[PDB]
mmCIF file of C-alpha atoms and ligand atoms in Angstrom:
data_model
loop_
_atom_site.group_PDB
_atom_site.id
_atom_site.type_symbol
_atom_site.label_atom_id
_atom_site.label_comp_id
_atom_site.label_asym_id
_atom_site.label_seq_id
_atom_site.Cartn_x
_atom_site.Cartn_y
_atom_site.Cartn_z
ATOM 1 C CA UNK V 1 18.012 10.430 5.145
ATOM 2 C CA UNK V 2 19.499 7.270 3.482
ATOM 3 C CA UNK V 3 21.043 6.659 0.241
ATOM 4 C CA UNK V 4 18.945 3.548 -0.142
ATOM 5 C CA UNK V 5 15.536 4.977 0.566
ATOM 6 C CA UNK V 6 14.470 7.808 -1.345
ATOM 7 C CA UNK V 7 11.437 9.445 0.522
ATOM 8 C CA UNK V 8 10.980 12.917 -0.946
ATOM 9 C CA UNK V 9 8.075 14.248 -2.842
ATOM 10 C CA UNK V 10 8.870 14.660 -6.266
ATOM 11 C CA UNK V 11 10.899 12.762 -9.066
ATOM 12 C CA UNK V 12 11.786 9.501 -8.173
ATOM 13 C CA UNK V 13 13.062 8.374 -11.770
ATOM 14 C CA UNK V 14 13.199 9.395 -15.181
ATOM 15 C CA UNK V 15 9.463 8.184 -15.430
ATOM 16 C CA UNK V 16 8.258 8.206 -11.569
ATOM 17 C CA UNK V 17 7.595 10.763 -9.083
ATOM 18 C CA UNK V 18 5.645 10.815 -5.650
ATOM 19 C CA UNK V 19 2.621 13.046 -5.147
ATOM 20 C CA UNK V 20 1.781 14.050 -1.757
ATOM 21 C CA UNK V 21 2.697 12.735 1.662
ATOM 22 C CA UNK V 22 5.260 10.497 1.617
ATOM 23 C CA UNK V 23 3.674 8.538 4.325
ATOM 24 C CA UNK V 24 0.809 8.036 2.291
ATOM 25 C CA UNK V 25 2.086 8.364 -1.243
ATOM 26 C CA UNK V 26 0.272 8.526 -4.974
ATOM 27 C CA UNK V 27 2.790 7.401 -7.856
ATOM 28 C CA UNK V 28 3.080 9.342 -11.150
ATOM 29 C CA UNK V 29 3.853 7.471 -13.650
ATOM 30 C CA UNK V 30 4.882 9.255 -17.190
ATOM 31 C CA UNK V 31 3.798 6.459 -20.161
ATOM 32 C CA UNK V 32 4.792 8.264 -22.831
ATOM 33 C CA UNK V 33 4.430 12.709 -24.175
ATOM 34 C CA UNK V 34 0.711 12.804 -23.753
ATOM 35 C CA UNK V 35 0.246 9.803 -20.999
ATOM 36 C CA UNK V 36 0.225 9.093 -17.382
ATOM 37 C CA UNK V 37 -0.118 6.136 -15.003
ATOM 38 C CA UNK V 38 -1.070 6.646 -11.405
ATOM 39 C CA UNK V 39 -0.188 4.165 -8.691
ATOM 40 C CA UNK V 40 -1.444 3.992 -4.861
ATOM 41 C CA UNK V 41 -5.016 5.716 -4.092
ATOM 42 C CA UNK V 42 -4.192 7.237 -0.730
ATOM 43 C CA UNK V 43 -6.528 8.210 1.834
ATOM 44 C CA UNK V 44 -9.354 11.138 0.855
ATOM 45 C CA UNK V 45 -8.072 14.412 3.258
ATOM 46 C CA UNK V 46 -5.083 14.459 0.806
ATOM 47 C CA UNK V 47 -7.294 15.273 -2.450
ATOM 48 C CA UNK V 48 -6.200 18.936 -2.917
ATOM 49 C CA UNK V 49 -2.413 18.326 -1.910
ATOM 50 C CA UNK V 50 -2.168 15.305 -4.326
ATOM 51 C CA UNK V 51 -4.142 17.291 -7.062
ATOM 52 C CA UNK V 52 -1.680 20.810 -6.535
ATOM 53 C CA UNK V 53 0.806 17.876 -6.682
ATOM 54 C CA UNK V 54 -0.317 16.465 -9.562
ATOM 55 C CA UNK V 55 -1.118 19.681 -11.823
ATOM 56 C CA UNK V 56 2.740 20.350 -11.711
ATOM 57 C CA UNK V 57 4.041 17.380 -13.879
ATOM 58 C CA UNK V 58 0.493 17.100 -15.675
ATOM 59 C CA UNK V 59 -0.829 19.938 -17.691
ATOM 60 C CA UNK V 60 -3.940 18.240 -18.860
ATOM 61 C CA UNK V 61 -5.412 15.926 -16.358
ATOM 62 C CA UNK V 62 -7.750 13.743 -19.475
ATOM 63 C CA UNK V 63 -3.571 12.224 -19.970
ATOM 64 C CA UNK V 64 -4.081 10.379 -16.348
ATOM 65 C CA UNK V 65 -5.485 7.029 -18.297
ATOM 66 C CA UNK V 66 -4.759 4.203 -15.573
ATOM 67 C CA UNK V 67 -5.308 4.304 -11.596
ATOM 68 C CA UNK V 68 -3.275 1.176 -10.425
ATOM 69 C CA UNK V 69 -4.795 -0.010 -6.947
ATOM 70 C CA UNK V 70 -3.476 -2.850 -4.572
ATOM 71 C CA UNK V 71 -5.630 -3.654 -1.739
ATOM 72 C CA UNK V 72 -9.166 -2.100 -0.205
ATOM 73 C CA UNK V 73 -7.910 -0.674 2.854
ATOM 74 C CA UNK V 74 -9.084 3.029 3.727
ATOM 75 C CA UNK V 75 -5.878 4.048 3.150
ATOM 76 C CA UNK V 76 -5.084 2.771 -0.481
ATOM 77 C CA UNK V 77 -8.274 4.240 -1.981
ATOM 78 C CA UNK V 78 -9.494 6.975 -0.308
ATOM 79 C CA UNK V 79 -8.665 9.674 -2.838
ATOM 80 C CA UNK V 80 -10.527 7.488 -5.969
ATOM 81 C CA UNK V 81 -14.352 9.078 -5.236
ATOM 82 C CA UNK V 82 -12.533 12.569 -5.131
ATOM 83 C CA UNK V 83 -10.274 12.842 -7.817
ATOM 84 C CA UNK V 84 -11.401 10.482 -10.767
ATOM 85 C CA UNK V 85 -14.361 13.312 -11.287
ATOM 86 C CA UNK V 86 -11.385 15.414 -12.303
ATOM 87 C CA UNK V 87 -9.791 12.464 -14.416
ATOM 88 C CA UNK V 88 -12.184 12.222 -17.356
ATOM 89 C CA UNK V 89 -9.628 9.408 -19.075
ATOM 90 C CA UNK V 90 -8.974 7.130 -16.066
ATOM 91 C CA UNK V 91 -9.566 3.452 -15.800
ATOM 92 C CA UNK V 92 -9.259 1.962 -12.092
ATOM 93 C CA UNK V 93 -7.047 -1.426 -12.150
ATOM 94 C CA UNK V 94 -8.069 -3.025 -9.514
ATOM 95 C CA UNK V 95 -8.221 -7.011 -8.238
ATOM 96 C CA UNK V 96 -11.775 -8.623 -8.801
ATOM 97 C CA UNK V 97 -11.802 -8.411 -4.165
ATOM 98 C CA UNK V 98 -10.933 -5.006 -4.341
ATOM 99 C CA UNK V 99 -13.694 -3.991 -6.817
ATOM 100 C CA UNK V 100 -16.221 -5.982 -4.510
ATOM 101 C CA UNK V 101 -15.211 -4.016 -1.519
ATOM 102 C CA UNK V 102 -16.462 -1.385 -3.360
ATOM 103 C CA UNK V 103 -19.879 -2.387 -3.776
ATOM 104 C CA UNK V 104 -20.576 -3.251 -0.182
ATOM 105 C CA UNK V 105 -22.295 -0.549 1.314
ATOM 106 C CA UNK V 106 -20.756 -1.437 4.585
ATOM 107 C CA UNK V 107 -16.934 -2.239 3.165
ATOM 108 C CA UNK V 108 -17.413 1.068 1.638
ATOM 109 C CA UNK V 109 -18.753 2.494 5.135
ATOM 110 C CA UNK V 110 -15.675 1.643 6.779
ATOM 111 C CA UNK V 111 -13.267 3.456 4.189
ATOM 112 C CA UNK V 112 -15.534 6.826 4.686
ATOM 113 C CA UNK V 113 -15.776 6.528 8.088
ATOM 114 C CA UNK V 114 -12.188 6.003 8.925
ATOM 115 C CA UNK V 115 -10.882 8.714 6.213
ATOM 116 C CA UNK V 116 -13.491 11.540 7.731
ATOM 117 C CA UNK V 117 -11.907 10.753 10.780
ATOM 118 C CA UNK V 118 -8.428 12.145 9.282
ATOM 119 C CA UNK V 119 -10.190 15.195 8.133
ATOM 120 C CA UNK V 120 -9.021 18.511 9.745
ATOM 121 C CA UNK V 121 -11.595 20.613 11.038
ATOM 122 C CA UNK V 122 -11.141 23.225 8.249
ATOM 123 C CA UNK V 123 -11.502 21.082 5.303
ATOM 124 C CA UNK V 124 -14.179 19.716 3.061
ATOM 125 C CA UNK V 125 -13.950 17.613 0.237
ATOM 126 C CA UNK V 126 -14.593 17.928 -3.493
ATOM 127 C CA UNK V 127 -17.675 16.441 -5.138
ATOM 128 C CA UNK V 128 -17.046 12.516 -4.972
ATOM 129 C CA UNK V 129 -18.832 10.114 -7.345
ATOM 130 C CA UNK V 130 -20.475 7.438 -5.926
ATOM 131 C CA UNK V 131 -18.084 4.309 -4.718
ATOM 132 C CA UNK V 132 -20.162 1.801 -7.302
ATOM 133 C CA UNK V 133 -19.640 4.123 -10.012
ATOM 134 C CA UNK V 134 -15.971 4.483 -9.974
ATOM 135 C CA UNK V 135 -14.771 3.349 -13.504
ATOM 136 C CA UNK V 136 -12.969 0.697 -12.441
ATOM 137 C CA UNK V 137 -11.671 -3.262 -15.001
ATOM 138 C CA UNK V 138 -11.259 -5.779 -12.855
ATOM 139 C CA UNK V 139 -7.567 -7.244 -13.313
ATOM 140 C CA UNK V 140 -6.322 -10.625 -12.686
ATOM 141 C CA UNK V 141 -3.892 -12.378 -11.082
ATOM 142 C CA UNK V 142 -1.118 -12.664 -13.487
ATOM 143 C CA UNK V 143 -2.507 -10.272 -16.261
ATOM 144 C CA UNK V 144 0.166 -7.655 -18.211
ATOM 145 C CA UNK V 145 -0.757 -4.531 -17.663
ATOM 146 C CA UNK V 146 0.427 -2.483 -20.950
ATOM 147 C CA UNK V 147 0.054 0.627 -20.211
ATOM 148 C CA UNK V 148 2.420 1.957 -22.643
ATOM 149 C CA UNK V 149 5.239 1.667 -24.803
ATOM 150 C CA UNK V 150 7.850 1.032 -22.212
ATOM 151 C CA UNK V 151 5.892 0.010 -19.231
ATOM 152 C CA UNK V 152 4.743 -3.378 -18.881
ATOM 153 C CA UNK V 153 3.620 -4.255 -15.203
ATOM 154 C CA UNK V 154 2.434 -7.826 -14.264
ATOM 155 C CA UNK V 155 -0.420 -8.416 -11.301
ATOM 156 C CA UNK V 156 0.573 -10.639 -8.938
ATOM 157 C CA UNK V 157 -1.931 -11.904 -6.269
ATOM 158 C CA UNK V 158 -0.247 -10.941 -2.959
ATOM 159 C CA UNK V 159 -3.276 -12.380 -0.003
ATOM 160 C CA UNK V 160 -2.433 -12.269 3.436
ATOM 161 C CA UNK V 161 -2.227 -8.486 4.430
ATOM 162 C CA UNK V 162 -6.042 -8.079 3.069
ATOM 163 C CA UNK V 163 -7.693 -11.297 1.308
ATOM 164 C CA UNK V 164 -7.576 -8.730 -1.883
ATOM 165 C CA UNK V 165 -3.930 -7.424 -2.154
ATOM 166 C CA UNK V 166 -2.419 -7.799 -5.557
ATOM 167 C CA UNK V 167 1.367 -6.505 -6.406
ATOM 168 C CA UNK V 168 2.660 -4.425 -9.448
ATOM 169 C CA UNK V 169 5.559 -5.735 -11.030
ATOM 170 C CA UNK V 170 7.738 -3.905 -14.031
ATOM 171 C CA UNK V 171 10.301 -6.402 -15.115
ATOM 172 C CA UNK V 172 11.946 -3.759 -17.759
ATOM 173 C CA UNK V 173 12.646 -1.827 -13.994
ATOM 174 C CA UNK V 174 12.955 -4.915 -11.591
ATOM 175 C CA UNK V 175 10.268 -2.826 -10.074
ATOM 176 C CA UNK V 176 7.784 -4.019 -7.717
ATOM 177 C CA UNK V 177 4.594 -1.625 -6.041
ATOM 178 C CA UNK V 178 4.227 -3.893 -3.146
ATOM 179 C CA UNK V 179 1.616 -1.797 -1.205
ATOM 180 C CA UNK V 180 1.631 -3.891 2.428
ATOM 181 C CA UNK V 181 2.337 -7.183 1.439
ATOM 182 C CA UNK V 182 5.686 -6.950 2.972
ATOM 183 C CA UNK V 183 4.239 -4.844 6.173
ATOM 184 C CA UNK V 184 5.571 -1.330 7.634
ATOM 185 C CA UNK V 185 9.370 -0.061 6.375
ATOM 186 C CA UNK V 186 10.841 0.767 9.628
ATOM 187 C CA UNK V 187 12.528 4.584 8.830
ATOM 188 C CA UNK V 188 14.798 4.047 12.178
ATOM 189 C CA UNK V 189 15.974 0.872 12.220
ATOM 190 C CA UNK V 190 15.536 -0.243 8.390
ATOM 191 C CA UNK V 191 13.625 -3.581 8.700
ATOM 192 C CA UNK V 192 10.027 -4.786 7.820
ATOM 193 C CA UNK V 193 7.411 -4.761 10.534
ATOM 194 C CA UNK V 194 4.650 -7.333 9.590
ATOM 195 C CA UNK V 195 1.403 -6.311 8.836
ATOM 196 C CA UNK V 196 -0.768 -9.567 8.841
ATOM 197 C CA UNK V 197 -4.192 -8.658 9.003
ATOM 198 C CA UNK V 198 -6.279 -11.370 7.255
ATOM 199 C CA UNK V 199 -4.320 -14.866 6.702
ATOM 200 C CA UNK V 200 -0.379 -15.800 7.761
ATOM 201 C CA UNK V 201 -0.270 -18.511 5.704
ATOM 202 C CA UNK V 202 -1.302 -16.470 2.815
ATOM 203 C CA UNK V 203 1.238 -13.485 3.782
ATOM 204 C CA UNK V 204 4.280 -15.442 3.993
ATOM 205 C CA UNK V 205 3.190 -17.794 0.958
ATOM 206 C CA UNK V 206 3.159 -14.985 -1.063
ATOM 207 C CA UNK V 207 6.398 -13.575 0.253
ATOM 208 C CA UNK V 208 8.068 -16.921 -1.306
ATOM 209 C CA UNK V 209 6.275 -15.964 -4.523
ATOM 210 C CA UNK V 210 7.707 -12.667 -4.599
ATOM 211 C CA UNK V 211 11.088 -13.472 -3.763
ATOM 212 C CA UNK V 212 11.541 -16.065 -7.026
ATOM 213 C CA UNK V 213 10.969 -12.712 -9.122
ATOM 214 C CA UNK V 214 13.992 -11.672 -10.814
ATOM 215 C CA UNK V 215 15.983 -9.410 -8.620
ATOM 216 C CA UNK V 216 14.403 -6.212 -7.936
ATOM 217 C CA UNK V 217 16.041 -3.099 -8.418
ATOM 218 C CA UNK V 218 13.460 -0.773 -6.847
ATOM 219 C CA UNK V 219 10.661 -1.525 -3.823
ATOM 220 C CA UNK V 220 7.774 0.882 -3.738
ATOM 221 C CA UNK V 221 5.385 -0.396 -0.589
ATOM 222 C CA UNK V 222 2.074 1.944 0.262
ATOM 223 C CA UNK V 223 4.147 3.623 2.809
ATOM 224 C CA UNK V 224 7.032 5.644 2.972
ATOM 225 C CA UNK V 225 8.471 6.059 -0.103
ATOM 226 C CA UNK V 226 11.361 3.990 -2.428
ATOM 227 C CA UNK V 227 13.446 1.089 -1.621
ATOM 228 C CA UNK V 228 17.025 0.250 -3.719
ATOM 229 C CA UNK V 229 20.124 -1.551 -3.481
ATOM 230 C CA UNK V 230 20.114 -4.168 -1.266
ATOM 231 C CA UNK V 231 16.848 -3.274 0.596
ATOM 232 C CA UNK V 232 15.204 -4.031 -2.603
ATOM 233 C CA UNK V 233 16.950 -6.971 -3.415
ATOM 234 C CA UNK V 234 16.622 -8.486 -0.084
ATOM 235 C CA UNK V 235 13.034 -7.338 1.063
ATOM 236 C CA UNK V 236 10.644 -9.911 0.266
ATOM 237 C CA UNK V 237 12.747 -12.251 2.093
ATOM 238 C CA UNK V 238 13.388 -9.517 5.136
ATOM 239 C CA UNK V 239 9.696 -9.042 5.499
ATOM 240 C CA UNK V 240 9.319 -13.117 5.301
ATOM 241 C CA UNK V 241 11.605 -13.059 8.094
ATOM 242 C CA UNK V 242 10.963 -10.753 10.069
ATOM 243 C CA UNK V 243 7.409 -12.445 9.882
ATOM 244 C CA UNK V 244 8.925 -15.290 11.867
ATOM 245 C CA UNK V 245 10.752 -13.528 14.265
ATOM 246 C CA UNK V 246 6.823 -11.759 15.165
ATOM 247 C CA UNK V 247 5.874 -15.244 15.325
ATOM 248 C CA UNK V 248 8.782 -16.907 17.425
ATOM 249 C CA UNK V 249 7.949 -13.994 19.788
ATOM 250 C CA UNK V 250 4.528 -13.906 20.351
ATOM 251 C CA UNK V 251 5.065 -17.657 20.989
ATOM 252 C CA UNK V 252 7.873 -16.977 23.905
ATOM 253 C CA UNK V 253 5.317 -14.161 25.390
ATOM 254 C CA UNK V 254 2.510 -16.784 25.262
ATOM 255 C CA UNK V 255 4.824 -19.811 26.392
ATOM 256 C CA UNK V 256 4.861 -17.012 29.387
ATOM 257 C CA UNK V 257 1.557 -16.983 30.467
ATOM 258 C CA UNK V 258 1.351 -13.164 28.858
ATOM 259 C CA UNK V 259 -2.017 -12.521 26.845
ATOM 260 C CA UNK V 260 -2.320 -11.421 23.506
ATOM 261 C CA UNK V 261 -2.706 -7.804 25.123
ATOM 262 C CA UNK V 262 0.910 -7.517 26.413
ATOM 263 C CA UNK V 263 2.878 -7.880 22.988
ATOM 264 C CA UNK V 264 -0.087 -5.990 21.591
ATOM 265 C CA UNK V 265 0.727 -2.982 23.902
ATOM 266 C CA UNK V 266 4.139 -3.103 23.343
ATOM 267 C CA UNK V 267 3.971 -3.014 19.522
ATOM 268 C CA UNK V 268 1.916 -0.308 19.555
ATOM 269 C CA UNK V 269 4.340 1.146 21.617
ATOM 270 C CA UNK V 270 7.505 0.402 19.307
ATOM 271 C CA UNK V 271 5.683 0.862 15.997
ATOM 272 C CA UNK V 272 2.322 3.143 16.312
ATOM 273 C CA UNK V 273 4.676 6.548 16.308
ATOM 274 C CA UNK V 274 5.254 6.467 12.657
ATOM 275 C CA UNK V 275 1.429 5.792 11.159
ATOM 276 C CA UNK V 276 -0.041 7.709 13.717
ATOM 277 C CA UNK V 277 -0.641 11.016 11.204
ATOM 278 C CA UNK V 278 -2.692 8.971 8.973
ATOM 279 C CA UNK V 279 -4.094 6.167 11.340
ATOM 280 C CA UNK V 280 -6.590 7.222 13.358
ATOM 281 C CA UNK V 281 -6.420 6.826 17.398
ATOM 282 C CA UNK V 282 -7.097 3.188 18.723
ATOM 283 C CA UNK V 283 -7.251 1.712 15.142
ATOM 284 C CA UNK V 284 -3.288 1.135 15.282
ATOM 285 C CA UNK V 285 -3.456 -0.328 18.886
ATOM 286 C CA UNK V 286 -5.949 -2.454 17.882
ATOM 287 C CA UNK V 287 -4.115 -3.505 14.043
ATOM 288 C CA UNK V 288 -1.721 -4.737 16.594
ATOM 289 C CA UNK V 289 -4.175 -6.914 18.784
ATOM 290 C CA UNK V 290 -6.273 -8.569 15.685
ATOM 291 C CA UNK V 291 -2.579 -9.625 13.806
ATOM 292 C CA UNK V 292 -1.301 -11.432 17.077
ATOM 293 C CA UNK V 293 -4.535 -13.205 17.220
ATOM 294 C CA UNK V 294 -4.337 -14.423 13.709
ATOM 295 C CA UNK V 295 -0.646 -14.861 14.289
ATOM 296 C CA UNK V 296 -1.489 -16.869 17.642
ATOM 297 C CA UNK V 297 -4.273 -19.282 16.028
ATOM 298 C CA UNK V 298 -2.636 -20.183 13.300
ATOM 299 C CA UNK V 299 0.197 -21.353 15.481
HETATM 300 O O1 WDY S 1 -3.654 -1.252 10.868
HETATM 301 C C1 WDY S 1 -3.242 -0.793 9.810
HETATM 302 N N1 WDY S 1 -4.008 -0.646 8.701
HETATM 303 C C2 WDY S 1 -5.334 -1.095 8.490
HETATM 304 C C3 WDY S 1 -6.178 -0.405 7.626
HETATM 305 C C4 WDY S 1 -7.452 -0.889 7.375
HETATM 306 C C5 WDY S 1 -7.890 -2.054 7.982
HETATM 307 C C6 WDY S 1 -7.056 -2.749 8.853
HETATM 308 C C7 WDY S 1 -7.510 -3.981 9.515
HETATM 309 C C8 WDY S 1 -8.350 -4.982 9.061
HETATM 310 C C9 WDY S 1 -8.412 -5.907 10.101
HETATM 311 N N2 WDY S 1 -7.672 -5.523 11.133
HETATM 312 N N3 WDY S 1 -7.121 -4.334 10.759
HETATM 313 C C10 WDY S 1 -5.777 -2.262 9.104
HETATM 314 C C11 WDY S 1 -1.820 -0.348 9.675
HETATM 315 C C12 WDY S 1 -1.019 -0.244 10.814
HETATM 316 C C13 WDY S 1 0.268 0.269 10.729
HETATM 317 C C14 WDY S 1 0.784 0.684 9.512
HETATM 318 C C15 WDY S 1 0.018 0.570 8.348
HETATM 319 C C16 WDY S 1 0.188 0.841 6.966
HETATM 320 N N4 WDY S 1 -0.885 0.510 6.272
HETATM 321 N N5 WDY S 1 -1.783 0.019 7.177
HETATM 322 C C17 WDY S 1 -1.285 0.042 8.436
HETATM 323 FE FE1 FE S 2 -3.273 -2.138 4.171
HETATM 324 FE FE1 FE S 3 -1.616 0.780 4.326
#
């Protein structure tokens, strides 16, 4: 592994450790003796693992008070129906999007169907409240989270990914929970792969945002653990570039005659390996295929 990425579960920090899969982690924050933060809401299979996880640092569960969320997708909420039953205390942060999502009946369709698809054959869930019943405030862009005596965080709208995504940012730690607003950390080559999925404009626009913060010290994205030293300090611009370079080359490709389908293809070829144990079959292939399209119109 590398010095600058730490991606074991476990502590992370005096006040943060990592519950579950790495690829598809849950942050524990400690707020003070007899409170707890959580961050990320993973996909649903993972319930008992993050739970077994969770029951280690946390002897009573009614401490969890706060479930910090950043975007809709499957994968960044699956676990809330499942485990806030067992979290009499929590309140769900979410953005006011991401709470909608959760009253569509077929947003919410989506999530379920693309989690059971992750489910081994052996397992079956807890008892899950319903989606519109989750006990979720609305937070907005720009509000200060206090959550407790030394942790501050600051929503930040972060659009582009998924027309909800909001950011998490501790100041006090020059810490930022960026889910996917700066795309896929690359574990073998140690750059950002984008992961454009609604708006470009809105992706890289709020990649300048996020690089005027004051310099970051730590980088937590949905996926694959911690970022520090310079790939924190450096990211948002990294993923803003390597945004471009997506760009530049489906542009050359096209300039070619090539259909969207060839760089699509070969993405999936480059990048699918490492999501491919919590992204179901064709849905990676075809992640690849809807972002060149939105890359390709608006350009
Ligand atoms: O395609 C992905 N996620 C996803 C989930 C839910 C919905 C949509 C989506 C919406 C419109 N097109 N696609 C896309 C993906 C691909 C590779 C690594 C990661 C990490 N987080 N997500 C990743
Ligand atoms: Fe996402
Ligand atoms: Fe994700």
């Amino acid at each position: 592994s590398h010095m600058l990425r730490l991606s074991a579960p476990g502590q992370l920090d005096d006040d943060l450790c990592l519950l579950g899969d790495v690829q598809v982690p849950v942050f524990l924050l400690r707020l003070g003796e007899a409170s707890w933060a959580l961050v990320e809401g993973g996909i649903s299979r993972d319930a008992e693992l993050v739970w077994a996880d969770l029951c280690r640092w946390v002897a009573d569960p009614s401490q969890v008070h706060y479930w910090l969320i950043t975007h809709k997708h499957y994968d960044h909420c699956g676990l809330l129906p499942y485990l806030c039953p067992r979290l009499p205390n929590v309140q769900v942060l979410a953005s006011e999007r991401t709470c909608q999502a959760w009253k569509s009946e077929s947003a919410v369709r989506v999530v379920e169907r693309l989690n059971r698809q992750l489910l081994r054959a052996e397992q079956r869930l807890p008892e899950a409240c319903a989606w519109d019943a989750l006990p979720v405030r609305a937070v907005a862009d720009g509000e200060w989270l206090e959550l407790g005596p030394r942790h501050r965080l600051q929503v930040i709208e972060a659009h582009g990914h998924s027309d909800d995504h909001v950011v998490f940012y501790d100041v006090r730690r020059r810490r930022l929970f960026c889910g996917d607003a700066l795309g896929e950390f690359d574990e073998a080559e140690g750059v950002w792969r984008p992961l454009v999925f609604d708006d470009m404009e809105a992706y890289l626009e709020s990649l300048e945002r996020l690089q005027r913060l004051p310099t970051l010290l730590q980088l937590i994205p949905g996926h694959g653990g911690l970022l520090r030293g310079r790939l924190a300090a450096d990211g948002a611009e990294s993923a803003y570039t390597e945004c471009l370079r997506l760009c530049r080359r489906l542009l050359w490709r096209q300039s070619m005659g090539e259909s969207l389908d060839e760089l699509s293809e070969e993405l999936h070829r480059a990048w699918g390996g490492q999501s491919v144990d919590f992204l179901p079959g064709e849905l990676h292939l075809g992640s690849m295929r809807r972002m060149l399209e939105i890359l390709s119109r608006q350009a």
